Amino acid sequence: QIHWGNLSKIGVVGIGSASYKVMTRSSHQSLVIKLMPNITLLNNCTRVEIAEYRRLLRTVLEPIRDALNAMTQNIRPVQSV
């Protein structure tokens, strides 16, 4: 396929070939990001900071939750047709 002889006449050589393996994904596993830490051994010393953190998170999480609900609400069982 590649004409090594003619390519070598214009200074081009192959310096290695290899087989080609691509990654395919299979099976499944659930991973959960727990956003709220366990703070009980800090005895309310972080109450203000935790409440502010929770409020900052809400702005980010609500649009994602809404986007996911927008899709799954259009996915029904077969016989609804």
Binding site: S8, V13, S19, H28, P37, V48
Partner: protein, 367 residues
């Protein structure tokens, strides 16, 4: 069996349709969420395998728990209460900054987005090795390392009541496509007069039956037994450049070397291919310099004429001949000189179009 309500949804890409169906199959049942919510409330580890018999294991990760457990709790009766909250507040703001960067508005389509495990690194506490170890990756061989880093996650649930994000990952394994060969190409400069040129070819190409293709090496690792790519690497190549690689030297383009010099010699098949107009070539065995015929462009050095050659100051023993003695330039059809810089491409294209619009009016007048 489920059906997508396409008239209701109206518009969606295949990627969104397929991820949406996958979302329905992989999301936790409505009461599996209530179980998970209660399990998360009662734990205190940075990473924890949540096992509820019957249901599958769920890997829970808490992004600031190691800091709370290792740094804040041991200080509980040596630092003030205000200081403890201030210390944690700095961590929470930095952690929120990462959540915002990854899950915020820069995330275009949460349903079909695939987040690499490495991009999740900060969301998972700044490192992913313990997560991967809990999933069974040992770190004992490089292939398992590459596969473990090829993991991608999809979002399947966002809990705004208890503030957690459920992701689904899949395990990469290698799919060898035995008919595709990846080839690494490497060029040496050659001389026409005092002008130093080289042929413009891709660094990697792929052969596939009848096809020569382009090859995107971005997502690939060149392991000793094969090229491992986490994504498709093959993409089309124009017929003209395929013809170049098939032996049509006139189809291969060429350009002048950048800077002062190019790669002026190379070892290949135990021979030395060298631009001996551009460097001193010398036979060490006999002590005699190797001149390049000025109507030749390269020298092909093998042990039939010089067992040990010196080339730009490096001494190399070579094997029996695998490349013919150089041919005269006049027996080689060189292709067009080009530049790949984008302004040069655009400026010369604009010129070519103008010359063609001129040429297109005269052959109507004369015909």
């Amino acid at each position: 069996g489920v059906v997508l309500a396409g008239a209701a949804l109206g518009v969606a890409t295949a990627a969104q349709i397929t991820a949406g169906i996958a979302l329905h199959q992989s999301m936790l049942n409505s009461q599996a969420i209530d179980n998970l919510r209660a399990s998360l409330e009662t734990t205190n580890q940075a990473i924890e395998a949540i096992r509820q018999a019957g249901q599958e294991m769920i890997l829970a990760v808490q992004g600031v728990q190691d800091y709370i457990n290792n740094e804040l709790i041991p200080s509980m009766n040596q630092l003030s209460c205000d200081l403890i909250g201030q210390k944690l507040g700095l961590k929470l703001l930095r952690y929120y900054t990462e959540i915002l960067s990854l899950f915020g508005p820069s995330l275009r389509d949460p349903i079909s987005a695939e987040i690499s495990i490495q991009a999740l690194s900060y969301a998972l506490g700044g490192d992913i090795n313990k997560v991967l170890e809990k999933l069974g990756y040992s770190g004992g061989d490089l292939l398992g390392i590459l596969e473990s880093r090829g993991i991608k996650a999809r979002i399947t649930h966002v809990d705004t009541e208890s503030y957690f994000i459920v992701l689904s990952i899949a395990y990469p394994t290698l799919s060898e496509i035995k008919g595709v060969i990846v080839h690494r190409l490497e060029g040496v400069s050659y001389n026409i007069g005092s002008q130093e040129w080289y042929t413009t070819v891709p660094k990697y190409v792929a052969t596939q039956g009848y096809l020569i293709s382009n090859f995107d090496e971005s997502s690939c690792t060149f392991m000793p037994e094969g090229t491992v790519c986490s994504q498709n690497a093959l993409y089309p190549m124009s017929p003209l450049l395929q013809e170049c690689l098939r032996g049509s030297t006139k189809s291969c383009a060429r350009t002048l070397v950048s800077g002062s010099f190019g790669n002026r010699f190379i070892l290949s098949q135990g021979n030395l291919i060298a631009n001996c107009a551009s460097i001193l070539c010398k036979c060490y065995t006999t002590g005699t310099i190797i001149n390049q015929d000025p109507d030749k462009i390269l020298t092909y050095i093998a042990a039939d004429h010089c067992p040990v050659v010196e080339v730009n100051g490096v001494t190399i023993q070579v094997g029996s001949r695998r490349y013919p003695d150089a041919v005269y330039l006049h027996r080689i059809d060189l292709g067009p000189p080009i530049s790949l810089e984008r302004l040069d491409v655009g400026t010369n294209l604009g010129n070519a179009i103008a010359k063609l619009e001129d040429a297109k009016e005269l052959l109507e007048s004369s015909d």
